[model samples]
Target: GSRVPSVAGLDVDAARQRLKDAGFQVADQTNSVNSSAKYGEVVGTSPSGQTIPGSIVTIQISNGI
Candidate 1:
């Protein structure tokens, strides 16, 4: 099993689809129009969004903050 690659330059809607297709749960996202500007840039992850080979990882997505 391999970790799904991150989708660069995707908006929140597109990002959600990409993550969903990768079998990753959309736990949560945080951001704002004034702060984040975009809705889905993946500012941060719970486990730091590290690439793994084979294992279950919990990723907490953030739109900005």
Candidate 2:
């Protein structure tokens, strides 16, 4: 298992890519347009930290304010 990189503040595509490159799979997604975060920004990740290889990572992205 390895630490899950901080993908906060990153756009959805970038965040997803980061996770994929780290050998984690994007398994689920949620988004909110009313969020303070910028459009496509990654607000959070499920099970964030010490994730095993090929683990599923759930991403919460901001659609826009």
Candidate 3:
């Protein structure tokens, strides 16, 4: 499995770019509330840690403003 990059706290778009640069692909994304964070920020990722190269990474984005 390929090591998952740390994209927490980054803006959704930036995080996506990071994933791409790290050789990972964004398989899916969903919205959720994050009272402590800004909207459109990355909350976390699914199947965290090393994953197979080109594996799909699920990015959780913040929906809170």
Tens-place lDDT per residue, model 1, 1-65, is 33655654445566567556766655454433334535445444433344543444333233444
For model 2, give the 10-residue run with minimal summed lDDT: 28-37
Q: Where in model 3 is the C-alpha error above 4 Å? A: none
Clashing pairs in 1: none
Worst 10 residues of 3 by lDDT: 47-56
lDDT of 2 by residue, 1-65 (tens): 48777878877788778777877777765645556667667776676656776645677776655
Candidate 1 global TM-score: 0.43
| TM-score-better candidate, 1 vs 3 | 3
Model 2 misplacement above 4 A:
none
Instruction: Name the 10 consecutive residues with the lowest summed lDDT in model 1.
Output: 53-62
Q: What is the TM-score of each candidate against the true structure?
A: 0.43, 0.70, 0.70
Sequence-dependent TM-score of model 2: 0.70
